Design an enzyme around this catalytic site. Sequence first.
Site, PDB file in Angstrom:
ATOM      1  CD  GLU A 148     -31.792  -3.195 -13.333  1.00 28.61           C
ATOM      2  OE1 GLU A 148     -32.082  -4.372 -12.986  1.00 28.61           O
ATOM      3  OE2 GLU A 148     -31.601  -2.818 -14.543  1.00 28.61           O
ATOM      4  CB  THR A 149     -28.264  -1.845  -9.940  1.00 25.71           C
ATOM      5  OG1 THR A 149     -29.057  -2.966  -9.587  1.00 25.71           O
ATOM      6  CG2 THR A 149     -26.833  -1.958  -9.476  1.00 25.71           C
ATOM      7  CG  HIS A 200     -26.992  -6.704  -8.070  1.00 26.20           C
ATOM      8  ND1 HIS A 200     -26.704  -7.835  -8.840  1.00 26.20           N
ATOM      9  CD2 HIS A 200     -28.271  -6.842  -7.660  1.00 26.20           C
ATOM     10  CE1 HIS A 200     -27.812  -8.556  -8.961  1.00 26.20           C
ATOM     11  NE2 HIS A 200     -28.790  -7.961  -8.283  1.00 26.20           N
ATOM     12  CG  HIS A 235      -4.265   8.817  12.226  1.00 28.32           C
ATOM     13  ND1 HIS A 235      -4.423   7.769  11.329  1.00 28.32           N
ATOM     14  CD2 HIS A 235      -3.868   8.279  13.402  1.00 28.32           C
ATOM     15  CE1 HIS A 235      -4.138   6.640  12.016  1.00 28.32           C
ATOM     16  NE2 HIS A 235      -3.811   6.933  13.259  1.00 28.32           N
ATOM     17  CG  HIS A 239     -10.015   9.717   2.247  1.00 30.89           C
ATOM     18  ND1 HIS A 239      -8.646   9.766   2.090  1.00 30.89           N
ATOM     19  CD2 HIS A 239     -10.547  10.211   1.097  1.00 30.89           C
ATOM     20  CE1 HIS A 239      -8.340  10.311   0.902  1.00 30.89           C
ATOM     21  NE2 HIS A 239      -9.519  10.572   0.266  1.00 30.89           N
ATOM     22  CB  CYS A 240      -6.975   8.996   7.267  1.00 27.35           C
ATOM     23  SG  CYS A 240      -5.341   9.267   7.977  1.00 27.35           S
ATOM     24  CG  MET A 281      -8.362   5.655   9.536  1.00 23.91           C
ATOM     25  SD  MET A 281      -7.062   6.717  10.301  1.00 23.91           S
ATOM     26  CE  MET A 281      -7.945   8.085  11.033  1.00 23.91           C
ATOM     27  CG  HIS A 318      -3.624   5.763   7.666  1.00 18.64           C
ATOM     28  ND1 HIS A 318      -3.606   6.527   8.790  1.00 18.64           N
ATOM     29  CD2 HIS A 318      -2.389   5.274   7.524  1.00 18.64           C
ATOM     30  CE1 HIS A 318      -2.402   6.458   9.360  1.00 18.64           C
ATOM     31  NE2 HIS A 318      -1.624   5.675   8.599  1.00 18.64           N
ATOM     32  CG  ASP A 376      -8.870  14.505   1.029  1.00 20.38           C
ATOM     33  OD1 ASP A 376      -9.756  15.277   0.748  1.00 20.38           O
ATOM     34  OD2 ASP A 376      -8.107  13.933   0.186  1.00 20.38           O
ATOM     35  CG  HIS A 398     -30.407  -4.217  -6.416  1.00 22.92           C
ATOM     36  ND1 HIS A 398     -31.050  -3.808  -7.555  1.00 22.92           N
ATOM     37  CD2 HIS A 398     -31.180  -5.212  -5.921  1.00 22.92           C
ATOM     38  CE1 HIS A 398     -32.175  -4.468  -7.710  1.00 22.92           C
ATOM     39  NE2 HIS A 398     -32.261  -5.364  -6.770  1.00 22.92           N
ATOM     40  CG  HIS A 441     -13.362  13.477  -1.409  1.00 22.86           C
ATOM     41  ND1 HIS A 441     -13.719  12.394  -2.129  1.00 22.86           N
ATOM     42  CD2 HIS A 441     -12.073  13.297  -1.022  1.00 22.86           C
ATOM     43  CE1 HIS A 441     -12.697  11.555  -2.210  1.00 22.86           C
ATOM     44  NE2 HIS A 441     -11.655  12.091  -1.542  1.00 22.86           N
TER      45      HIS A 441
HETATM   46  O1  LIG Z   1     -32.016  -8.523  -6.594  1.00 23.98           O
HETATM   47  N1  LIG Z   1     -30.898  -8.808  -5.967  1.00 23.98           N
HETATM   48  O2  LIG Z   1     -29.854  -9.492  -6.203  1.00 23.98           O
HETATM   49  O1  LIG Z   2      -8.795  13.011  -1.745  1.00 19.48           O
HETATM   50  N1  LIG Z   2      -7.999  12.087  -2.233  1.00 19.48           N
HETATM   51  O2  LIG Z   2      -7.761  10.859  -2.010  1.00 19.48           O
HETATM   52 CU   LIG Z   3      -4.930   7.805   9.438  1.00 20.65          CU
HETATM   53 CU   LIG Z   4     -30.685  -8.661  -7.971  1.00 19.51          CU
HETATM   54 CU   LIG Z   5      -9.782  11.369  -1.609  1.00 23.22          CU
END
Ligand SMILES: O=N[O-]
Ligand SMILES: O=N[O-]
Ligand SMILES: [Cu+2]
Ligand SMILES: [Cu+2]
Ligand SMILES: [Cu+2]
Lengths: 345, 345, 345
Positions: free
Chosen positions: B272-273, B299, B87, B127-128, B143, B138, B90, B248, B92
Amino acid sequence: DLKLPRQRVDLVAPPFVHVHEQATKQGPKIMEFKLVVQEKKMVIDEKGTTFQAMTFNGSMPGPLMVVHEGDYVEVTLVNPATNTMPHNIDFHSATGALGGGALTLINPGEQVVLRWKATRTGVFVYHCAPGGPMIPWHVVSGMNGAVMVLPRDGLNDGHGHSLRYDRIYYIGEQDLYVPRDEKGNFKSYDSPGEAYSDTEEVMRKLTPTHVVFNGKAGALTGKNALNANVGENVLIVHSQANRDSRPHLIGGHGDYVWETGKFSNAPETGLETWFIRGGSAGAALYKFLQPGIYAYVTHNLIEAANLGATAHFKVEGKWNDDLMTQVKAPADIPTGSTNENLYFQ
Amino acid sequence: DLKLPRQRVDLVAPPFVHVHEQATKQGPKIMEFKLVVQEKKMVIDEKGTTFQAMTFNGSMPGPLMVVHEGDYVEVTLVNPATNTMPHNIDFHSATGALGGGALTLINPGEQVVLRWKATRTGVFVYHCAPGGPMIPWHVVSGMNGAVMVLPRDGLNDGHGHSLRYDRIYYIGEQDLYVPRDEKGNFKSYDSPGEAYSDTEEVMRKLTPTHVVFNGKAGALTGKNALNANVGENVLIVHSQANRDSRPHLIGGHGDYVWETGKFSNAPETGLETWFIRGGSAGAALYKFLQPGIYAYVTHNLIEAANLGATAHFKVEGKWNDDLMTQVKAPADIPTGSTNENLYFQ
Amino acid sequence: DLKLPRQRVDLVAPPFVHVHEQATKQGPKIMEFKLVVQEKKMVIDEKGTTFQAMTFNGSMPGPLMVVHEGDYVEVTLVNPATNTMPHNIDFHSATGALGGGALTLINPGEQVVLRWKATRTGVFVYHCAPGGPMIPWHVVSGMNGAVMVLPRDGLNDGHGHSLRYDRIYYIGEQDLYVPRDEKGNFKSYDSPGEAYSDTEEVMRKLTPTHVVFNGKAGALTGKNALNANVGENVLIVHSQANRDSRPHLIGGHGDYVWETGKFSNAPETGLETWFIRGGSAGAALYKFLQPGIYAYVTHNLIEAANLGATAHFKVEGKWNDDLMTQVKAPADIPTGSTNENLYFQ
Ligand SMILES: O=N[O-]
Ligand SMILES: O=N[O-]
Ligand SMILES: [Cu+2]
Ligand SMILES: [Cu+2]
Ligand SMILES: [Cu+2]
Ligand SMILES: OC[C@H]1O[C@@](CO)(O[C@H]2O[C@H](CO)[C@@H](O)[C@H](O)[C@H]2O)[C@@H](O)[C@@H]1O
Ligand SMILES: OC[C@H]1O[C@@](CO)(O[C@H]2O[C@H](CO)[C@@H](O)[C@H](O)[C@H]2O)[C@@H](O)[C@@H]1O
Ligand SMILES: OC[C@H]1O[C@@](CO)(O[C@H]2O[C@H](CO)[C@@H](O)[C@H](O)[C@H]2O)[C@@H](O)[C@@H]1O
Ligand SMILES: OC[C@H]1O[C@@](CO)(O[C@H]2O[C@H](CO)[C@@H](O)[C@H](O)[C@H]2O)[C@@H](O)[C@@H]1O
Ligand SMILES: OC[C@H]1O[C@@](CO)(O[C@H]2O[C@H](CO)[C@@H](O)[C@H](O)[C@H]2O)[C@@H](O)[C@@H]1O
Ligand SMILES: OC[C@H]1O[C@@](CO)(O[C@H]2O[C@H](CO)[C@@H](O)[C@H](O)[C@H]2O)[C@@H](O)[C@@H]1O
Ligand SMILES: O=N[O-]
Ligand SMILES: [Cu+2]
Ligand SMILES: [Cu+2]
Ligand SMILES: [Cu+2]
């Protein structure tokens, strides 16, 4: 308790929009709307495929409601005894009780009256949401529309300039999940309940069989193309209650785009293609500059051309050769051409 | 070489977040975190489906790390000898060496210590990423987590107003790809390596079998609903390391949304979303205005209701009838109603 | 009729970009470009899978065209008699006639000359669109590229600061839909027309078999990695004519990102991962701060690692231990460690 003036609104079928003001000097009102649930078999594609739809006011999408910030929206939701299913309504515009769903569950033969204060500007989805797996099934059966909450001063560009549309259209985009038999043919059913189990299996794989505007492939093409004229500023409201879309006006742009759909945010300018997140409405303004046919698509072109998701605008006016011109019509390639010297050969 | 003060942080299991300051007057520190890799079979759905998970600190998602701009983050990554797989990690949030992946590959029985400077504000995925096809496997095995790098002055609205949350929750959304037998039943395996070949075949078709918050269908519903009170400003951090999501809050909004998740950008208002691009974290602030149950979903309502992607908030407080009210409870439709004259019949 | 100076541009194969100015003091010109359609079998993956491609200038993507706001773009589109299919071109940058498609339909043996005014700044898709189901098929067969319309003053940060790139690369991302036989093996065909019916069936299910940069898995890895140096500001133009993408630079960021791709909008700062909506181009600037290999991916990591969508940058320069450092190389876990007391065990 409220005492404000009450104004009844007569809804109209999409893609048209009931009459309203953009800028208003009227104060807050109680804006009264009626939505009537209709379950019915509908034709969704140009081959005549039917499916057991469930709608607000008999249409996919449901009609566009338009109010202003600070209005109260008083919705009578009706579930006729000819229906088979409970229904309700969730306004993404509204605050509390799962958008009103938890206050609007009605059996066939019942109606209910919900009021919500329009505190948030923008275009918003409304959709049915009865509970559990019934939520996606009612929505992808057709039970979704939109509401626009305009600022009282109307639209602006977020840089202190008023924006005004000459025309407004509502494009509801619907993902549909139609079962197929062992031969690949779409199956028919006598009722939504009979279609459910096979439809849920299609839904689970997350790949629609159809993606349609105004409830069917070809709804907004040919005879039903959307009209406009050169020089008109057109608002195009686009909603998708369940699934992402990427709208594009072929041969045009989005002059002013609220892709997340909320007027408290400045629009982006000059977009080629925008993005409607599933569960939302967005809006684009465009001033037509050229006449002719425009296609309005989701720019997954497979969806657009092959699963139903193309509308047309027919725009009247004079051609502008300065913006675009055919310098030379199709001609045979110069026998003298030396295209075999080109770097990629 | 650095000499800055060192502060050890005790991580807590999602959706909770370890104690931290929003605004701080402390200077840069070396913030020390430990993540321990745990491979283990986990239950992912309400029918008891298991799958061979791989986690940071035994949870999906991994825990939320919180530091401030200009802090150094010194992570001890541990790969216990009871694990079967190499493992790494990374960030970001970090600059160089594939986010730290190229400096953190550890076999079972090994640990490694990485430091990265928190130069970029926002919420970020970690993440891995061991290399090649092992990267997606992974990550979609569990992960992945997130780190939040706050401005030292805390959050602002991008218009010179401070924003402060009363509560913070971390919603990690996980796409899972669980093999099925010829009968459609989910398959079980004795080890991740034994599950790999059949899982890669599901992965390749890009359609998850489950989409879950906090590592399982129903994780954050009923007894484990997220608590809040009317008037509280709640930050909801949402991450998805592999696949898009559209969060949402049903019956609410995003008051202030950083959907791309980076605090150097002003948030959008009144959404809203929103949209979490796969490979990112975003965040939304919302001030609750109404008590009751709220569902928090992606949603794509099929994913939400049918593949596991629903959480609940239980909000204590007084109902505000001005924002929303049931004007008339469900009643039989007026025998005198004239719904058969309606324009869509 | 126009009389402006005419400047011929020699296009170059992606990911490189023909020479151009960022800021210019030249006035509007007629910028002359030639695109030659080439249908040809191409190798798309590292196992040697071939497919019947259709290209502009023999490459996937088509070449990047660069002009300035207020230039006129005069494109000669050529359809050699060795081709089998009609072709045309739609510029998302252009106004009218379906982006030029309705003025550029040419049979094999024909060419056509279109002029469009560059009124909209940004990066934009161009693609073939012959009509109907031929639109998606020509696009996902390879027939798409991009054009960049720079402001005459070059790029800015939307806050009155000039931005200048040292280097520019064009990453065209292509979704491909390659038929499989009953055994799961990719099928070969002697011509695009023979491949069509089986390809349309794959297209309909909306799940690509390959997602590639610069026309094939591994195109921009190893020997063909993209070069840069520490301190260089690199513009990375990314297009996807049919399908969403979520670009990410592993171990870097997007300093300045126009994910919707239009320079009239201020870029977002400090992104981890951005979003290219299908049917658009976007762009990201990044100043490299660390040497070494960077992977540039769509952050659907299954697509990145397993369906072809990874490029590499090889960055020359000195390592900055202040940004990131390995404090302790991999070592056996302290026998004295007490990891079995950890809260998640
Ligand atoms: O407002 N929700 O699906
Ligand atoms: O950070 N890259 O998957
Ligand atoms: Cu891993
Ligand atoms: Cu909705
Ligand atoms: Cu990444
Ligand atoms: O924003 C529109 C409308 O929403 C309310 C709640 O009904 O305010 C929310 O958003 C405000 C602006 O972002 C916040 O200051 C506030 O805390 C939040 O409740 C109304 O107050 C506002 O008019
Ligand atoms: O799509 C698979 C397979 O099914 C058939 C019927 O056997 O056609 C069906 O599918 C088409 C694409 O969805 C539809 O056009 C048609 O309406 C439907 O019955 C075959 O023709 C096709 O190869
Ligand atoms: O932006 C946060 C942080 O990132 C750094 C690099 O560590 O700067 C990058 O972004 C700056 C603002 O956009 C650019 O001016 C700069 O060129 C780029 O390296 C730090 O300098 C900054 O504090
Ligand atoms: O989904 C196809 C088919 O598989 C069965 C088992 O034969 O159920 C499986 O799939 C369901 C949906 O994913 C799960 O609820 C269940 O856990 C799983 O075993 C059939 O019931 C179903 O029709
Ligand atoms: O915006 C770039 C360019 O587009 C034009 C049309 O060719 O203007 C459009 O957008 C303007 C700014 O948003 C609007 O004011 C205008 O109505 C709309 O036609 C050009 O005028 C402009 O230079
Ligand atoms: O993918 C299903 C199945 O097909 C086989 C051939 O029988 O391999 C094909 O699919 C692989 C993934 O797309 C490719 O690597 C290979 O190029 C292709 O021929 C089986 O190996 C696989 O299990
Ligand atoms: O430009 N339309 O695909
Ligand atoms: Cu319903
Ligand atoms: Cu073509
Ligand atoms: Cu297009």
